[PDB]
Each structure stands twice: as structure tokens, then as C-alpha cells.
Amino acid sequence: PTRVGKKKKKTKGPDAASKLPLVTPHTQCRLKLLKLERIKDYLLMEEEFIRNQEQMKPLEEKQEEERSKVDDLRGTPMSVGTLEEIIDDNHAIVSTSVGSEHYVSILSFVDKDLLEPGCSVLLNHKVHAVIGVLMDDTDPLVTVMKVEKAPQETYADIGGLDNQIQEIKESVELPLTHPEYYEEMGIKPPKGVILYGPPGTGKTLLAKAVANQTSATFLRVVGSELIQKYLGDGPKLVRELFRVAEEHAPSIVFIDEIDAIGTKRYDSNSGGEREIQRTMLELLNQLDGFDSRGDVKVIMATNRIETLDPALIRPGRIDRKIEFPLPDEKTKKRIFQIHTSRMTLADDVTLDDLIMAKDDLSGADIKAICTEAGLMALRERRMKVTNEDFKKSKENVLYKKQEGTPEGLYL
Amino acid sequence: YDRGVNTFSPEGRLFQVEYAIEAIKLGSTAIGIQTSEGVCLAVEKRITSPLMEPSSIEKIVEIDAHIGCAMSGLIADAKTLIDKARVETQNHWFTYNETMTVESVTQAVSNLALQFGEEDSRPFGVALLFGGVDEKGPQLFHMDPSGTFVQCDARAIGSASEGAQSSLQEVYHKSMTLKEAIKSSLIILKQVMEEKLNATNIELATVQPGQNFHMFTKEELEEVIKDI
Amino acid sequence: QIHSRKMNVSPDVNYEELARCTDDFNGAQCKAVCVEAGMIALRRGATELTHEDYMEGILEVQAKKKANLQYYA
Amino acid sequence: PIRALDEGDIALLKTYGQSTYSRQIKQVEDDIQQLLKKINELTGIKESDTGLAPPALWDLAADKQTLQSEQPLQVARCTKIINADSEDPKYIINVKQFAKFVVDLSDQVAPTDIEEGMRVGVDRNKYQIHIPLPPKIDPTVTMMQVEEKPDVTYSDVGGCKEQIEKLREVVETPLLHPERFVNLGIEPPKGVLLFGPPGTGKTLCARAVANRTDACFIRVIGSELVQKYVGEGARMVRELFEMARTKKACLIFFDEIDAIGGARFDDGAGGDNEVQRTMLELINQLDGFDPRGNIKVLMATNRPDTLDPALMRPGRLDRKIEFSLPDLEGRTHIFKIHARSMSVERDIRFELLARLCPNSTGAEIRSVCTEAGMFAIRARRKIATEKDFLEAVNKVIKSYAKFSATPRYMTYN
Amino acid sequence: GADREVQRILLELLNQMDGFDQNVNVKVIMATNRADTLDPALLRPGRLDRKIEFPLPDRRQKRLIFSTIT
Amino acid sequence: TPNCRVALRNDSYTLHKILPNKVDPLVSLMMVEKVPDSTYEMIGGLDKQIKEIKEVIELPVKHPELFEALGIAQPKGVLLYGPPGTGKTLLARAVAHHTDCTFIRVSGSELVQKFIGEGARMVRELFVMAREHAPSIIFMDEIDSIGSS
Amino acid sequence: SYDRAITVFSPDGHLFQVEYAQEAVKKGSTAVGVRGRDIVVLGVEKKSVAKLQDERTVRKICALDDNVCMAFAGLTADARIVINRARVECQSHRLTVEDPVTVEYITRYIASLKQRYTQSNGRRPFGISALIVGFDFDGTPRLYQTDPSGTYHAWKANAIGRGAKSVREFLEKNYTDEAIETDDLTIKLVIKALLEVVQSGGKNIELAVMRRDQSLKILNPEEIEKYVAEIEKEKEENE
Amino acid sequence: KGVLMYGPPGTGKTLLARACAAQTKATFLKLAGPQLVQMFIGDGAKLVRDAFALAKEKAPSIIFIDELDAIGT
Ligand SMILES: Nc1ncnc2c1ncn2[C@@H]1O[C@H](COP(=O)(O)OP(=O)(O)OP(=O)(O)O)[C@@H](O)[C@H]1O
Ligand SMILES: Nc1ncnc2c1ncn2[C@@H]1O[C@H](COP(=O)(O)OP(=O)(O)OP(=O)(O)O)[C@@H](O)[C@H]1O
Ligand SMILES: Nc1ncnc2c1ncn2[C@@H]1O[C@H](COP(=O)(O)OP(=O)(O)OP(=O)(O)O)[C@@H](O)[C@H]1O
Ligand SMILES: [Mg+2]
Ligand SMILES: [Mg+2]
Ligand SMILES: [Mg+2]
């Protein structure tokens, strides 16, 4: 036919948070008192409407004779099995959890179209026959890794990174919101993006900010989540994780610190490194599976790039490599603008002086300065923050790493 | 194996001089054509900054009042070979009252193109084109860091070397004229460079028999560009 | 010549050329030279061999490749 | 001069600064997040499907002809057979997940079709052979023996035609003209491995002649031969090399043989956990059952470490065909490939591009063509210019590859 | 690899000697060759209070070992 | 409930009872259950270091609204360092005695166990066990081990 | 990746030890310089005095002859030798040939001295980069620069030191096609360019000018304070 | 009863041993090296002893061992 199987009959479940990201006074004002009490009104009513929903349903059902007897025709402790192959004569070959394979019958009420090799079924104890097919349900390990809440603030939170923000928005948000541009020239969008650089630069921020403002299903996988010890549990989850990503949305799979799952492929004969390496190999295979990826975007992020397997880094798999350097003396002005916004800044400070004297502190360095200078005002019993608290915060926080320079040698 | 000029390969060879030929490949392109009316010559400047003064970048130097030059590769190696080649023609005039021929210039130049480990240093990183009008008419020659001296009728070196030479064999013949071969040259240049060709990207040099002066074009070059 | 019995070889074979040109070769490689000479004659579709086909087989065994090298006049 | 904070001194901080709206704004935000919770357990919508059928056709099925499948029908398992005996069965059979057993056949069969390496129906208690079954023919081979035309043109992998000419001589010439072999007195070579840099044309030169074969073609996943269960992958590679030698004029393409490879003739081979089950069985059936065959097998990998000299002993594998980089004309051909199918300008020249791509693969050449299009999307364009490609080569090659320090140049012009 | 495995066996030894728990009434007797080599975190008292050097013999102890053997 | 174990009747597989106490294998030295070993006063001569740690543990927990009113994120990580061994443990045991809070002792070398996997997954199983007793302080012994480079 | 000898070519044709010397330039102090209509000028970024030393021995701008100037980067050990050598050559030239030394002749000497010093093993190359300014060759103002490879080269405006790339991009958008006459305007160009310093403290600038007929004129930190005041005053009027 | 063949490469190691039992007919019995190497633990040593004991049951049989340096270490 033209529309064979109508593409797996499957919807997508996106996020449910970002309930109202318009709290825009950001201060002690009666608007935010008025705004949030509106939000309280709509949530109490949606509670009370569904409370009246399970209230005023007089049904008092009586089950059909066919449904009631089949529920007793099947066993009460039904067991979950796995299809392997099919013979259409109302008996096929399935597999148990331990792998014991049985020539069981399949009953003639199972809706005999969903039978595909790999689909999960329900079994009996006496004759182990296929009672009914189970819908494509997964283990609880992957369902934790599906994000429920939009975490944090939007692109206004970050302190000026716009050369690289405009990169990732072209690769992720633009093909979903507006895929007219690509068909105007017949160019496929990029597939994988690696975020790298020195730590404390904002790799995790840009992951959270994209996951804030999106309509995609955002999957959170962190590195060594994905490694287990039951000899097949490694490469099983990659197939399950990208099955979930395929059946659901045009989706975003964020795997963090893939350096813990990939480096240069040594193959010692001991059975400790193979389970790493077999999983390492199949992820790279399931990446370019090419069967039907269905717009699954993959974002990967490490600190060091040099210790990576070059089979990952090559194009065809991953198209974008993005540096996050220690920025400049200019976007520092924006980060000191942002991280000092919600505090009573006294009018004696010149925050440019701190940007002036130094060259290589990061965004996490700035946030630590802003917290420590606030703590120094509490020590000498204040609310506003003088210039001196920033002087003492700069001396206290920074001098722990700075080691090694040839002073006097140059000029 | 290589790591030093005092060492052979099992097959030949160097493996050190081969790497010196590779250092030419990242130079700027340069085309010279030998024609019976005289030898024309062309080069690409590759100017980086507008603050960068353009005439401090030399690609054509004047060896003598009837012999031009063109270089690529390392400038630091080039300024040594230009310095001797002016002296060698000058000593020859001092002891013979005549002009050294274009072929025998490069013999004196190649005699320390090959001295790099032959004492009792590294090889140079520069290829040269020598054009001139001696008593056998106009001549064009070419050398290399291996000192292999040869005569060419129309040569192009630097980067875009192979891309020029394939296109340059298409249009050359024996019965060219000088004004034909100048505009035949810069057609190849704008095909192989990356910028729009103007009066600031290139420069010319022509030597004629009766015109031993003026191995150069000075903003008559603007007239040749619109004659494309 | 024992290993070249089973194929069409041109009967213009100088084994004195084949004796001295071989150096640091075992009979495993000497069998390999004969087969590689026959495979190159299959590439051009020629029915016969030559000593140059063995010399081309010599270049194929230890993966040599020549050119003009502009040091050598 | 350090002082810490007394209990009255806490009350100075906690009081000052909007003492009218402080808790007033806060507990509204506090209990609404409590209310986000209290909706969610109140909703709890989740429901099952359990895969039933509409009762138009199964109500008569749900009669006693379910119990006739409950109590008369059985629960027999499947196994494999090691071997047999003469005049009396004494068959040796592995569950292999349970133990291996010495069993009998049941009375419902004939002892003919109980041959070795066969799926059979096994009793739960007495372990007798009830029904011989097929080896599950045929999704173990034909699901990768696709016998379907792939969408790769002969003009796609242009520029490396001599490496194609090697492969066109090795593969095509015995399969369609084993006649000049008789007219000359030769036999074709029957072993070629591929190795070299990644993204060079390995799968392309495979799939291009898989398009130009009009015949059986098999692509083999490297991790497919790696299995979870011990003694399962060897059983698969049995079934692949048996039912591929049946029909004529077929091709098998091994790919990413790093997982199944390694030198076993040399210092290592101290492995022997389900990788060597696949490996020792394939090298068993690679020779032995192949004098003068019809099905050619090609291997391809990125790592030249995993070469087996026992494979490279002749009889298994003969020729080292590797792939290389294009000189210039191969590259300029490839730029025309990846730019003819997109909205370009009719005046750009590509020989200027391949000057700027000294050591690069067609994977990178494709990446430039996509990236240059991405610069056209940045502004409002619908056709690419010359400088769109020029920024792309700078973005790809002159940024991450083996050249840096561009401003300090001033030694070469 | 595996040299930090040696180094962490030190750290587990240092923890279960002077951690929080202060396992009372257990006694530790150690004996080495040349002990200038080893870790100063061992040699701090509270952990390895007693430092006892054995000389070879000297005179008047050669007499005593001569007596006890003969 | 998340990670909810249930009592299952072993014959017919019926839910006998909701089991409490979600899975906590090998949490023995965690939540020490006996604090008194050394007091707050018997240290001496380290008063500035005592004041800073109380400002980062007791001050954010006893009065969180001070940092909320000031508008900075509260800190959570403290690295103690001293070369010879000078009071590194007493000051931890004093806080262990004087916090009135859930206190976790992890001498970190006990997360290596033997297996691929298992040595990592309990770290995830550690912080959820600290999230259950939600005011919490977790202590590391001797990060010259795991955490090197 | 052999980077441990100076007479070896890379297989793509490089001399990395020459290339590593120019990285040592980038840890040096910045210095800029333009040529004007008649008065040339150059400025440096002077580092902070450490409160307990004399500052007449931290000299970064020197004169070779009575009409040619010098500004460098890199490391002061190798800089002192090249200065002391070039003072001899511009003096010995005057003895052998009775002219004053042109600004083009002395840069060829410094470059050729750095040239022949590169080629032999056991001679670690000079990790400095010089700026040579002089309106000496018959009323014609010129400025050149050098390079640790030994390539003298002529610009019209220049920047070296740490983050010179910001300054060189700054000058191309700032050095007008209007040749800045009224030479305090030309000094106001450099002081504004060095006002885009790595730190721009305002009190950390030393500018040196030459009106093509006088000697070297080191400015004073009251006259230089006057020019910094009018730059901020004229910039406030632009709003 | 133990005579060892060795040289730079083969074609002369196998080839001379191929020449040995070609004209000596006393129940030749070849055996290769990594054919002993199995995933089966000990069936290297089982196959070593059982083939030797089988060759002991034959009266004139000599034993060949091919690439013993694969375990000769
Ligand atoms: N450019 C920035 N603008 C604003 N805040 C920043 C910036 N960079 C870092 N921060 C602050 O630093 C914190 C940590 O940043 P983040 O962890 O995303 O960097 P990272 O590169 O992911 O570091 P790591 O790789 O070590 O996790 C953030 O919470 C953020 O508040
Ligand atoms: N020589 C070439 N000619 C034309 N296109 C090429 C060439 N090399 C690479 N390409 C481009 O790269 C892709 C082919 O890469 P290829 O399939 O060879 O990778 P691979 O060798 O399978 O990589 P790996 O070995 O790492 O799996 C094609 O999409 C094509 O666009
Ligand atoms: N500043 C101090 N005040 C009082 N007692 C101290 C002090 N420093 C050390 N001690 C004594 O030293 C003993 C060990 O102290 P502790 O366990 O802190 O060593 P440590 O600093 O943990 O060493 P390390 O971390 O190197 O193992 C304790 O019994 C304690 O009484
Ligand atoms: Mg992070
Ligand atoms: Mg591939
Ligand atoms: Mg301690």
C-alpha cells in the first residue's frame, strides 16, 4: 500500500511544566501578588472540576459475559514474555525472561495484527500460552530519564554567549519550528552537537535553557547511568532509550559526559572492558541506525575533547563542534549584571574594576564572588554591599589554583 | 627514518628535500611565460591588512638591468639568494666587461642551493623563476631547493601550481606575442585566486630586448585589467 | 617456473633476470609474485606475462610505488 | 572583630524590607507548588490496553475451543541437536540454558528428519522429541539479505575509480565472465579486505556495486555477531553461511569487524567468551566448505590492527585493497556531486575549493556543502554565493584541523 | 593504572586507623626495612606513636647473644 | 509510590502488603546512630575555621530566609585541607555531635566494589537516601582516592 | 610531532621552533605606533610599579640614533642585546659612509642579525618583535616592524603584545582615510587606541613622540593626563 | 625422538616437512597449533594427549606439530 502501518500509531508526550513563566516584576510588587493569585484560582478550579468529575458519575457497571469469563479464562498471575518468531497456525514460539523458549499456543482473541517479532506479550503458567499482547511498555530505568519539569530560566538567564546560542538554535529549534528554509535548498539539518570547553562555562546551562523553551520531549541521560553488569544490560538500554525517543516526539536526547563511555577502543580480553566496549560500539551503531530516526536530536557534552574516540567525532555522525572558552572582558559585564540583579547593590562599587584586573575567571567564578561578597556584608552586619566586600571576596575565592608564572622574565 | 639530511631511505631518497618542496606549496602563485618578443611575468600579492604597506611585499626583484626574478615559499630563505645573485653578476662584469647570461646566473645560485650539509644547516625553502634577455634571446628558467636547474617555456609555481600548469598548457604555443601573453596570463590568475582581481592583488614585470629598462608596470596595469 | 606452470605465461622468461632481482624473498613471496603477475595481466586483459609483470609483482608485494622524483635528472 | 549573630540580631534582617508583601507573595508561591503535586496524584490518569480483539470474531473462539487448546495442547520446548547414533537414537541435545541431555524421540515421528542442528519439540518431563521444526526460515538471513535496489548512483563515488577498478575486477569479472579464465588458464581471486580512514567511500563502494549486481546481496552488522547469550552467536553464523551458500551469485558484506576481529594467529587470542564462538566458527566455515565457490564476502574496518594472518593465509583472503584521498580532480568531482542537488549559483568554481582541502575526506566535503548552506540561512538567501563556501572551509578546515596561527603568516608571500 | 590501587590501600589503612570511629583496644604492630621511604601520614603520632630502631648489635650485646646461643 | 516494594503472596502472586523502607543496601556506616565522641570545646586554637563552617552549615539550615531576603544562592560544598594532619577529623566529629541533623559518614574507598556498574550506582543510591532524610550532611574521608584526575 | 630541532622540516613543511618563538611575543606588553603628517608617535602600556623600586630602569622605548626610535615586546634579556648591537651598527655605518642612517637600513640589519641566528643549532632564536619608527630619511616619516623569523616589514599603523588583535581590528575601523593632521589630533588617536587597553587604567600609559626635527620627547603625566581628559569630554558630547 | 625445524621464514619449514612424509609413508599425522586453541578449557591438553595416544596405538606413526611457536613462548 501507500501508507503501510500508518507509522506506528503513536503520539508524543511532551513536558507539562512552564505553567506560567510571566512573573515579570521579579520584585516585591502587587502585580506578582495579583499574578500568582490568578494562577491559584485556575489550579483550584481545575482541582474542583476533576473532583466533581469522579463525584457525579453514577455508573455502577455490570461487566459483559464475554469479558468477565475471559478474565477468568486467563490466569490471575499473568506473566510478561517476549515474542521471538510467529507461526500463524495459532501457536508460535516465544521466550521467557530467562530465555526458555516454548511452543505455546496463542489464543484467538489477541487481536492478531500487533504480533511483530520483538513485541511484548502476556503468558499463562499452566500452558504458558499467549493470553494477550502487551502494549510497548518499558522498564522503570528509562522512565526516570524522561523530564517532567522545565527546570529553570530562559535565555535571559545566561550572561552573553550569543555567538554560540545562535548556533544551537539553528540546529535544534529552527528545524522544528520552521522547517521551510531547508526544503528551499534541499539541505538536511545537522544531527549531533558536541559542547566542549573548560569547566564552569555554561555547558549545562544551555542544555537547561533549551529544555526550558521547547516543544520537544527532552531526555536526560548522564553518562554512567547507562552502564550495568548483567552481560547484556548495557546494549539493551540504548535500544530501549532510542525506541522511546523514536516513538515519541521530534525529540532531544541529552547525554552528558560521554567521555565516561567513550575513549579510543582498547580490547583487553578481560570481561570488564568488553561490557563497556560492546555498549560503546552499539550506541555508535544505534546513532546511525538510519531505519527511521524520525528527527531525534542528540546533544553531547564533555570538558575534554582530546580523549575521545575519533569514530564519534567524525562527520556523518556528529556535525557540530562548539567551543565554550573563558569568554572576554565584555560578557563578564553581563554576568555581573545578572548575578547582582536581585541584591541591594550599594552605589560605591565599580564592578568594572574586578573585570579589569583579571582575565581568566569563569561564570561559576562570578557567581561564587557574588555569593561571598553578600556573606561578607552579613559578617559586618549590613544589607547593602560595599566595594570592600567584593575586594575581600575576590581575594578569598580566587587564590586556590593560581600557580606558575614567569614574572620578570617577560615584559 | 628521515629526521636529518645525512640519512638514506631503503628505497631512495630524501625525505628531507621532499619536505622542502612541500614548503613551497604554501607560497603565493607566480606565472612567467617565455616568448620571442620578450619574457613577461606575473604574481599574486595576498595583502592582509590595509594598514600593511603594499610595496614592502616584494615578489619581483630586479637582479640586474636585464634579468628579473620571482619567488615563492619562505621569504627568509629568499633574501639570501637574492643578495648573492646580484653580487655574482656584478663580479662577472667587473672581471669580464660583459653581462652574465641568464643560464649562468642560476649556476652560481644553485652552487649554494646545494651546500646545506656539504660543508667539510637545512636546505632552503624557496623556489625561483628567472627571466631575462641575453645574447641567445629571451630566456626563462626555474630552480628548486634541490638545486635542480632547468629551462621552462612557461612555468607556474607556488600554491595553485598544478591547477595553473594544466590550464597553462592549453593556451601556449610557439608563435605567441608579448601583448597576447600578458592577457593570456592573468586570465589564469583570476581563475586560481580567491578574490576579485583588481589593480591591488597582482603585479607584472616584462623584459624586452630593446627595453632593458622597466621590468615593471605602474598603473598601466589598470588599463590591462579592463582589457580582459 | 613451477608455480607459473598452471597459467598462460609468455615463453620469453629470463630466469637469470628472475634470479638476481629477487632478494630477501621467501618462496611464499615468490609464489605471491607469480600470482600477482598473473593478476595484473588479468587487469589489462593480456593473455601472457612478462618479466616486467614480475617486477610489477615485486612492487606489489612490499607495496612499493615509483614516480619521477626530480632529484635524478 | 568577627562578630557572629545573636537571636535578636536575626530579627533585624528578617523584618526589614517589604514586611507587607514578603510572606504574602511567598506562601502563595509555596502552596501552589504543593497544589501542583496535589493535582498529580489526584489525576493519576494512567490506564492499560492489554491488546484484546473486538468481540465480533472471538466470542465463538472464546468457547470450548480455548480449553481444547488448554488441556489437549502442550507446552513443548525447543532445543538443538548435537548428533545422533546408528540403529538406535541416543540423541544428544542441548537446551544450553538448562543442561545438555541424552534423550529419545517420541512415537509421533520418524527417525529420518531429526538431523543434526535442528529445532525440535521437547517434552517438559520426559524430554522426548515431539516434533522436528525448521530453523526459523527465513528471518535470520533474508532480513539482511534484503534483495532490494539501493539508491546509490554509479556517479556518486567518482574520483576513486581505480580503487573501484580493483573492486570491479575482483567482484564482477568472475560472476559474469568466468570464460577468459578458461581462455587464459587462471582462476579468480577470492579474498579482499578493506581498511583505511573513516568516511572514505567504504560503504559507498560496497553499496554502489550492491546496486550494480542484480543479484543477492548481504550486509552484515558487526555488533549483530556479538550476542548476549553464550553459544548463540556461533549458532547464528552457522545459519548465515549455510543458507547463503545455497543460492547462486550472492554477495556478503562484513562491516565493522573490529568486534569479531583481532589477530588469533599472533600474540593475543586469550579471549574465548562468545566472541571467539563467532570467530572460530566463521573461520571454520570460511574454508572447508569453500573450494571453488560462488559467493564473495568482503570485510571492512577502520582499524588495521585486527588483521588475521590465518585469514591472510591464501584460501581465505588474498588482497589488501585500501582507500586513499583524492588528488585534486577527485575532490573537484565530489564538490560537484554534493552541490548539484542544492540551490547554488551558476558561476562558482570548485577547483578553488579543492585547493583549500589538502587532506580531507568526502565526509568532510559533504559537511562543508551543508555548512555553506547554513550560512545562507543566516541571512535571507535562497541561493549560495562564492563566499558562502569560503566561510565554510574556514569554519571547518581552518578551525579544528591541523592548521592554526593564521595571523602570524608573513613569511610566505 | 593500578598504582593508584596501591595508593588507595594506604588511604583505607589510614581511615580505619584514625577515622571517626576510634576502634578501641585494637593494637597495630608494624615492621619494615628502611623506613625513610614511607608516607609521613603514617608517621604522625596518634596513629604510629612508637618509633623503635633496632641497631645491629653493638658490643656488650654480642656477649649476650653469644651467651644465649651457647 | 516510586521504588515501592510490595509483599507478594508466593503462591498466587497477590499483593499482601505495601512494604515501606525503599531500598537501602549497604548504608550501615551511613547515619552513624551514635554521635558522642568529642565535643565542640575540646579543639582549641582553630576558632576562625570553626566560625566559617558554622556559617555554611548551621546558618543556611537554621535560617534559610536570610539568604532568600538577600538574594544569593546558598553554598553547599566545603573542602578542608591541611598537610600534616591537624584537626581534620575532630572538627568533623564535633559537627557530628552538635548538628541535630542527619549525618552521613562515607570513607570514600567503599564505592569500587568489584563490579562494572555497582561501584557507581550506589552513589545515586546514596543521595536519594540523603534526600529522604532531607536536612543532611555527607562527609568524605580522604579524597586522594577516587577524585584524583 | 617533532618540535625539538630548528633545522628540521615538518612533513607539511614547517619550522615549529621558529613558530614557538612568536608565541613568546604574545606574553609581552603591548605597544602601538602610527606615522603622522610630520610628527610620528608611539605608545606603550606600562605595567604597574611594585611600590618599592626605581622605575628609570624599566626602559621599553629606546633610541638607536638621534633620529630613530624603537619599541619591542617579548623578553628583556634578548631585547637588550639587539638594542646594544643596533646602536653600534647605526654608529659604524656613519663612520664608513658619512650620511645619517636611514630607517630602512637599520631594520635590514636587525632582521639579518635575527636571520643568521636562526639557522644553526645551539642558537635559540630571539623571541622579540620590534617596532622601528623614524622620520629620518629626508623628512619622510616611516615605521616598520620585525618578526622573530627575521622578516622586516612596513606598515602604516601597528600593534603588538598581548591582545594586539583587538587593537589592529580597532585601528582599521578608526584610522581614517583623512590623514590626521594637527598633530595633537594624531596623539589623540593613539591615546584613544591605547584607551582600549587590556585594562585602561589611564595612569599606565607612556607615549613618545617625535616632531621630525627635534630629539625624542617623552611626555609627562600631567600633559598626558590633559589628553585623557579631553577624550572623555569629547566622547560625552557625542551622546 | 624430537627433531626441530627452524629458519628465517617458511616455504622450507612446511615444505621440507611436506617433503618428509611425501616419500616416508609410515602413517603420517599432521597437527596445527591454534587448532588446539579452543574456547574449551583443557581440550587443548585433551586433544594433545588423545592424538598422541592415538599415534602411539599406531605402530609406525610419526607425529607432526605445525606452528608450535604459537604456544612455544
Ligand atoms: N555565561 C554564563 N552566564 C551566566 N552564568 C553562568 C555562565 N557560565 C556559568 N555560569 C554559572 O555557572 C554555573 C555552572 O555552569 P555549568 O555547570 O553550566 O558550566 P559547565 O560548563 O556545564 O560546567 P561543568 O561542565 O563542570 O558542569 C551555572 O549555574 C551558572 O549560574
Ligand atoms: N570518496 C568519496 N566519494 C564520494 N563521496 C564520499 C567519499 N568519501 C566520503 N563520501 C561521503 O561520505 C559518506 C560515505 O562515508 P563512508 O560510508 O565511506 O563511511 P565509512 O567508511 O562507512 O565510515 P566508518 O568506516 O567509520 O563506518 C557519503 O555520504 C558521502 O557523501
Ligand atoms: N588543633 C587540635 N586541637 C586539639 N587536638 C588536636 C588538634 N590537632 C590534632 N589533634 C589531636 O590529633 C589527633 C588526630 O587528629 P585528626 O584525626 O584530626 O588527624 P587528621 O587531622 O584527621 O589527620 P589526617 O587527616 O592526616 O589523617 C586527635 O586525637 C586530636 O586530639
Ligand atoms: Mg555540568
Ligand atoms: Mg559505514
Ligand atoms: Mg583524617
Swiss-Prot record, chain D:
UniProt keyword annotations, A-Z: Acetylation, ATP-binding, Cytoplasm, Nucleotide-binding, Phosphoprotein, Proteasome, Ubl conjugation
Binding site for ATP: 196-203
Upregulation: Expression is not cell cycle-dependent and occurs throughout the cell cycle.
GO MF annotations in UniProt: ATP binding; ATP hydrolysis activity; proteasome-activating activity
Highest taxon in the source lineage: Eukaryota
PTM comment: Monoubiquitinated by RNF181.
Subcellular localization(s) per the UniProt record: Cytoplasm
GO cellular component, one term: nucleus
Primary subcellular site in the record, as a coarse category: cytoplasm
Biological processes per GO annotation: osteoblast differentiation; positive regulation of proteasomal protein catabolic process; proteasome-mediated ubiquitin-dependent protein catabolic process; ubiquitin-dependent protein catabolic process
Record SMART domains: AAA (SM00382)
Positions bearing N6-acetyllysine: 96, 402
Subunit structure: Component of the 19S proteasome regulatory particle complex. The 26S proteasome consists of a 20S core particle (CP) and two 19S regulatory subunits (RP). The regulatory particle is made of a lid composed of 9 subunits, a base containing 6 ATPases including PSMC2 and few additional components. Interacts with NDC80/HEC; this interaction is detected only during M phase. Interacts and SQSTM1. Interacts with PAAF1. Directly interacts with TRIM5. (Microbial infection) Interacts with HIV-1 Tat.
Entry similarity comment: Belongs to the AAA ATPase family.
Protein name (database record): 26S proteasome regulatory subunit 7
Species per Swiss-Prot/TrEMBL record: Homo sapiens (Human)
Gene name as annotated: PSMC2
From Swiss-Prot, chain E:
Originating species: Homo sapiens
Source organism superkingdom: Eukaryota
Family listed: Belongs to the AAA ATPase family.
Name of protein: 26S proteasome regulatory subunit 6B
Function field: Component of the 26S proteasome, a multiprotein complex involved in the ATP-dependent degradation of ubiquitinated proteins. This complex plays a key role in the maintenance of protein homeostasis by removing misfolded or damaged proteins, which could impair cellular functions, and by removing proteins whose functions are no longer required. Therefore, the proteasome participates in numerous cellular processes, including cell cycle progression, apoptosis, or DNA damage repair.
Transmembrane intervals: none
Full protein stretch here: 280 to 349 of 418
Classification of source organism: Eukaryota, Metazoa, Chordata, Craniata, Vertebrata
Subunit structure: Component of the 19S proteasome regulatory particle complex. The 26S proteasome consists of a 20S core particle (CP) and two 19S regulatory subunits (RP). The regulatory particle is made of a lid composed of 9 subunits, a base containing 6 ATPases including PSMC4 and few additional components. Interacts with NR1I3. Interacts with PAAF1. Interacts with TRIM5. Interacts with ZFAND1.
Subcellular compartments: Cytoplasm; Nucleus
Gene: PSMC4
UniProtKB/Swiss-Prot annotation, chain F:
Chief place where the protein resides: cytoplasm
GO cellular component: blood microparticle; cytoplasm; cytoplasmic vesicle; cytosol; cytosolic proteasome complex; extracellular exosome; inclusion body; membrane
Subcellular location per the Swiss-Prot or TrEMBL entry: Cytoplasm; Nucleus
Transmembrane regions: none
Residues that bear Phosphoserine: 12
Alphabetically ordered keywords of this record: Acetylation, ATP-binding, Cytoplasm, Nucleotide-binding, Nucleus, Phosphoprotein, Proteasome
Coiled-coil region: none
Single GO term (MF): general transcription initiation factor binding
Domain of life of the organism encoding this protein: Eukaryota
N6-acetyllysine: residues carrying this PTM: 114
GO biological process: negative regulation of DNA-templated transcription; negative regulation of programmed cell death; positive regulation of DNA-templated transcription; positive regulation of inclusion body assembly; positive regulation of proteasomal protein catabolic process; proteasome-mediated ubiquitin-dependent protein catabolic process; regulation of transcription by RNA polymerase II
Similarity comment: Belongs to the AAA ATPase family.
Function per UniProt: Component of the 26S proteasome, a multiprotein complex involved in the ATP-dependent degradation of ubiquitinated proteins. This complex plays a key role in the maintenance of protein homeostasis by removing misfolded or damaged proteins, which could impair cellular functions, and by removing proteins whose functions are no longer required. Therefore, the proteasome participates in numerous cellular processes, including cell cycle progression, apoptosis, or DNA damage repair.
Record organism: Homo sapiens
From Swiss-Prot, chain H:
Binding site for ATP: 7-14
Domain of life: Eukaryota
Modification(s) after translation: Sumoylated by UBE2I in response to MEKK1-mediated stimuli.
Location of this chain's protein in the cell: Cytoplasm; Nucleus
Record note on quaternary structure: Component of the 19S proteasome regulatory particle complex. The 26S proteasome consists of a 20S core particle (CP) and two 19S regulatory subunits (RP). The regulatory particle is made of a lid composed of 9 subunits, a base containing 6 ATPases including PSMC3 and few additional components. Interacts with PAAF1.
Entry function: Component of the 26S proteasome, a multiprotein complex involved in the ATP-dependent degradation of ubiquitinated proteins. This complex plays a key role in the maintenance of protein homeostasis by removing misfolded or damaged proteins, which could impair cellular functions, and by removing proteins whose functions are no longer required. Therefore, the proteasome participates in numerous cellular processes, including cell cycle progression, apoptosis, or DNA damage repair.
Disorder association: Deafness, cataract, impaired intellectual development, and polyneuropathy: An autosomal recessive disease characterized by early onset of deafness, cataract, severe developmental delay, and severely impaired intellectual development. Patients later develop polyneuropathy of the lower extremities, associated with depigmentation of the hair in that area.
